[PDB]
Design a protein around this ligand. Structure first.
Ligand SMILES: Cc1cc(/C=C/C#N)cc(C)c1Nc1ccnc(Nc2ccc(C#N)cc2)n1
Lengths: 546, 408
């Protein structure tokens, strides 16, 4: 016999303060018991399990399903420590490199060469009930990682990785990836050299006594993997089929958006705003919902985008990454990442964050940071950006914005709609322009208020208001001054609230009043807004609070 | 050589912090560094039984081209168990900061605590399993390291201190701050003398040769100033009354009554208003008040320091450090922000580091920052510009402060 290297066992513990499972075995039919006895006899022969004495106090229930055996480790799993889970972050196909050959090796039997920590085995005990309950049940414990046990996937993967590391390291011309009970081995080598590498891998695995089926694997490119199709020189998502329907249900829409979101990583321009709007606030999965005319258009547009297959290419590390962004409207943004024109590695989208006020430049900036971070993950570097914003526009924005902000290396691409600044406040008071002193106030109980202004030219206005608040009346006062002034105007307010909003430079708002103010600002040539503290005897600036 | 028992705080588990995305160049640097550290026995590979994690990245210290590993132990430090600041340091004419963090690797780490120092070197696109390590020795950046190494550092430094009794030596984490009053040429030779005095003990440190020079005596008080003008417009006076109203939260006896009475009527903003006698006197009296220190200002070591920063434009930044609102312990202004003339975030990152350095020197701890930046923007870039071996805490300001106008 040829000595083989043992697989290092991983030491396993229960969670602090917790003991092992003591769960009652369910009764079973005479038929099920006989089935389990034979199954376990074979497993015992294979060395997977061992009979134990009556001293062990732990138990986990076992079932027979139409026979096959099912050990229900739910209780033990609750009591087992947390492990490092390596698979949490999965590779994105757009980050993969193209390969001439990809071979699949079945390593399903290797899984049972992984021994379970000796000290933990006692916690895996289970009992086959005896026929008619006239004798003690047959007791067994696992010697190998049990299917369904919490630690098995992490320990299996770590054990396989440890075995594969030296092979990968000494053979850098190949890539190795594990998924389920299979190894995928890719390379760009001449087919003879590549097949030689596979046989060498098989010889390497043999050192741990791990055997692989001589008969070739049935799985071959293209591979169906994690919702993708992988081909030797391209990738895509598995077929996206949007159903035909006369009526849509909460659940239907959730499933629709999910497919569209999934599709959006390679199909350019997918939109989900109007469809997602239908899900606002309510989560009754059976509630039918009528589609808005806007939602019907969005869906129609998406069907057209999805009418035929689109594929992405793989990553070429010897070339730059380029990211291009377009504004789609209603807070929606779409992008493409490519190295060569017309050959996307992937696509995607970004949506405006929930909030009171916003502007296009802020949104563009956010989309850029999202794409940057995604690109670090997938390719380990930032892409060169192509953005629908003029260089001069960006400079004006960031130099004058009250926050620190940054966008990495980028160039203007002239494809409408362009992102622009819609208004710019003066830094100094305007000579020759009328000065409007504005104010508003409301009564908290009756919600009645007033808004108005007085100017250096003697112009005055007070408007009585209903169903209002101090903050709304302060904005209304500014609105009135904008409405009633010429193209250049100085405005004096005591509203810290109003100052906080405009200094955020919104171009769109959830407040129609703010939107009205923005529309007015856009029409002005020059606007200087000055703040003063309230109730300090300042001229012009309140009594008219009556 | 014998390990100090170390524990986490009661009823608290180890850190489980996600590794953030790393650039290719930082991954390759870390693979190279950790491979060597592993050969030296400083770190060891770990298995899946260890579920803890702390983020890691790599930087280049100021004026260098050699990558330095930096572990973000902020979470572990909060979870670690607890183990007099020299007021003279901030008064020295020159302070050189040394990176002595390498020294910690000479002390083994408590076998039972090592698991909590787990970290991961990720792969691009997660194509290969992340490389998992834990520390076998005191790690750089861990608050337990200076505490455990303290008895050893004092012994190493004794002969140098004896022979140089006027030198102030202060350790913060991986930094050694060495302060003296003097001429610089001689200063640099004491630092070098110090170096050699340490090298001896070692027998090599990659960054010990480096010197970061400060001059804290040149640092000082930045007070509130009011304009001196011959012609005041309505706008000028409104701005002045605004600033004084704000200052009245810091200074009791500030008055604006007589000045506000100039703002009577409804005048064009650019119209010139002559000051009345009553208004000038009030203004003069306010000036005098602002020349005095703020009342009831004290440092308490049991409370957090808070640092606020404002972007003032044209590469200028203002900041304040306080524990209680309106009771500033320090204020300052930076007008250079070198190397970031077209990069706000790099400028802010340098300001954060400079302010933290001032804080360490003065109080021996780092402040909690209120940063004028969106979280996503900061989180995406700050590690590109970071050059210090410590990391403070921060939060983000989303609403523009009016106070910006008062520190201009
Ligand atoms: C992550 C990954 C998943 C599968 C997934 C297997 C499954 N199911 C197979 C392999 C080999 C890999 N690993 C890598 C690593 C680097 N480049 C590539 N490129 C690459 C992979 C597959 C095809 C094809 N056809 C072409 C190129 N794959």
């Amino acid at each position: 016999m040829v000595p083989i290297s043992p697989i290092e066992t991983v030491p396993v513990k229960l969670k602090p303060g917790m003991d092992g499972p003591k769960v009652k075995q369910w009764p079973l039919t005479e038929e099920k018991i006989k089935a389990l006895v034979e199954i376990c006899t074979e497993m015992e022969k294979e060395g997977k399990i061992s009979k134990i004495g009556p001293e062990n106090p732990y138990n986990t229930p076992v079932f027979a399903i139409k026979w096959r055996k099912l050990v229900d480790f739910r209780e033990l799993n609750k009591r087992t420590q947390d492990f490092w889970e390596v698979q949490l972050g999965i590779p994105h196909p757009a980050g993969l490199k193209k390969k001439k050959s990809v071979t699949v090796l079945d390593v399903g039997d290797a899984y049972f060469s992984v021994p379970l920590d000796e000290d933990f085995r006692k916690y895996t005990a289970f009992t086959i009930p005896s026929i008619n309950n006239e004798t003690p049940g047959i007791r067994y414990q696992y010697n190998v990682l049990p299917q369904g046990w919490k630690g098995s996937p992490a320990i299996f993967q770590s054990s396989m990785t440890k075995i594969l590391e030296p092979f990968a390291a000494q053979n850098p011309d190949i890539v190795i990836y594990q998924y389920m009970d299979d190894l995928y081995v890719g390379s760009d080598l001449e087919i003879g050299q590549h097949r030689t590498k596979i046989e060498e891998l098989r010889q390497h695995l043999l050192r741990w006594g791990l055997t692989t089926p001589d008969k070739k694997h049935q799985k071959e490119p293209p591979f169906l993997w994690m919702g993708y199709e992988l081909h030797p020189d391209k990738w895509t998502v598995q077929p996206i089929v949007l159903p035909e329907k006369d009526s849509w249900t909460v659940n239907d829409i959730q499933k629709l958006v999910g497919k569209l979101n999934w599709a959006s990583q390679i199909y350019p321009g997918i939109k989900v705003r109007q469809l997602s709007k239908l899900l606002r606030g309510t989560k009754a999965l059976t509630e039918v919902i009528p589609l808005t005319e806007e939602a019907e258009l969005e869906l129609a547009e998406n069907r057209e985008i999805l009418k035929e297959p689109v594929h992405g290419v793989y990553y070429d590390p010897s070339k730059d990454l380029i990211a291009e962004i377009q504004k789609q409207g209603q807070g929606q943004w779409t992008y493409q990442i490519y190295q060569e024109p017309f050959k996307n590695l992937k696509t995607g989208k970004y949506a405006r964050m929930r909030g009171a006020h916003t502007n296009d430049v802020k949104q563009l900036t956010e989309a850029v940071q999202k794409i940057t971070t995604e690109s670090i993950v997938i390719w380990g570097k930032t892409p060169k950006f192509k953005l629908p914003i003029q260089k001069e526009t960006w400079e004006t924005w960031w130099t004058e914005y009250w926050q620190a902000t940054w966008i990495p290396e980028w160039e203007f691409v002239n494809t409408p709609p362009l992102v622009k600044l819609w208004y710019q406040l003066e830094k100094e008071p305007i000579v020759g322009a009328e000065t409007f002193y504005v104010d508003g106030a409301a009564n908290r109980e009756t919600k009645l208020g007033k808004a108005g202004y007085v100017t250096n030219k003697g112009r005055q206005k007070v408007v009585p208001l209903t169903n209002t608040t101090n903050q709304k009346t302060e904005l209304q006062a500014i609105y009135l001054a904008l409405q009633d002034s010429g193209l250049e105007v100085n405005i004096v307010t005591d509203s810290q609230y109003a100052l906080g909003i405009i200094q955020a430079q919104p171009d769109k708002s959830e407040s129609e009043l703010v939107n009205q103010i923005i529309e007015q600002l856009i029409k002005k040539e020059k606007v200087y807004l000055a703040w003063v503290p309230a109730h300090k005897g300042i001229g012009g600036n309140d009594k008219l609070s009556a | 050589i014998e390990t100090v028992p170390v524990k986490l705080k009661p009823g608290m588990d180890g850190p489980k912090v996600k590794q953030w995305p790393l650039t290719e160049e930082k991954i390759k640097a870390l693979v190279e560094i950790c491979t060597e550290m592993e050969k030296e026995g400083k770190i060891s590979k770990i298995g899946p039984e260890n579920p803890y994690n702390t983020p890691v990245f790599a930087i280049k210290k100021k004026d260098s081209t050699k990558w330095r590993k930096l572990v973000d132990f902020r979470e572990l430090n909060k979870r670690t168990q607890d183990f007099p600041h020299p007021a003279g340091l901030k008064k020295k004419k020159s302070v050189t900061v040394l990176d002595v963090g390498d020294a910690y690797f000479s002390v083994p780490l408590d076998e039972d605590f090592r698991k909590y120092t787990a970290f991961t070197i990720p792969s691009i696109n997660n194509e290969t399993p992340g490389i998992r390590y834990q520390y076998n020795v005191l790690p750089q950046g861990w608050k337990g390291s200076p505490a455990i190494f303290q008895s050893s550092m004092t012994k190493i430094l004794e002969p140098f201190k004896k022979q140089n009794p006027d030198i102030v030596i202060y350790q913060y984490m991986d930094d050694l701050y060495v302060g003296s009053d003097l001429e610089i040429g001689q200063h640099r030779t004491k630092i070098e003398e110090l170096r050699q005095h340490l090298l001896r003990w070692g027998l090599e440190p990659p960054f010990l040769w480096m010197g970061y020079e400060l001059h804290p005596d040149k640092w000082t008080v930045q007070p509130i100033v009011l304009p001196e003008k011959d012609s005041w417009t309505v706008n000028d006076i409104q701005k002045l009354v605004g600033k004084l109203n704000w200052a009245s939260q810091i200074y009791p006896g500030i008055k604006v009554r007589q000045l506000s009475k100039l703002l009577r009527g409804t005048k064009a903003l650019t119209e010139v208003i002559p000051l009345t006698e009553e208004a000038e006197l009030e203004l003069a009296e306010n000036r005098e008040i602002l020349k005095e220190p703020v009342h009831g200002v004290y440092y308490d070591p049991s409370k957090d320091l808070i640092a606020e920063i404002q972007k003032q434009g044209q590469g200028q930044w203002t900041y304040q450090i306080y524990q209680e609102p309106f009771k500033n312990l320090k204020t300052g202004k930076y007008a250079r922000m070198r190397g970031a003339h077209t990069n706000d975030v790099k400028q802010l990152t340098e300001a954060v580091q400079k302010i933290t350095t001032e804080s360490i020197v003065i109080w021996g701890k780092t402040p909690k920052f209120k940063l004028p930046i969106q979280k996503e923007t900061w989180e995406t870039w700050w590690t590109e510009y970071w050059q210090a071996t410590w990391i403070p805490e921060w939060e983000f300001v989303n609403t523009p402060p009016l106070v910006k106008l008062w520190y201009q």
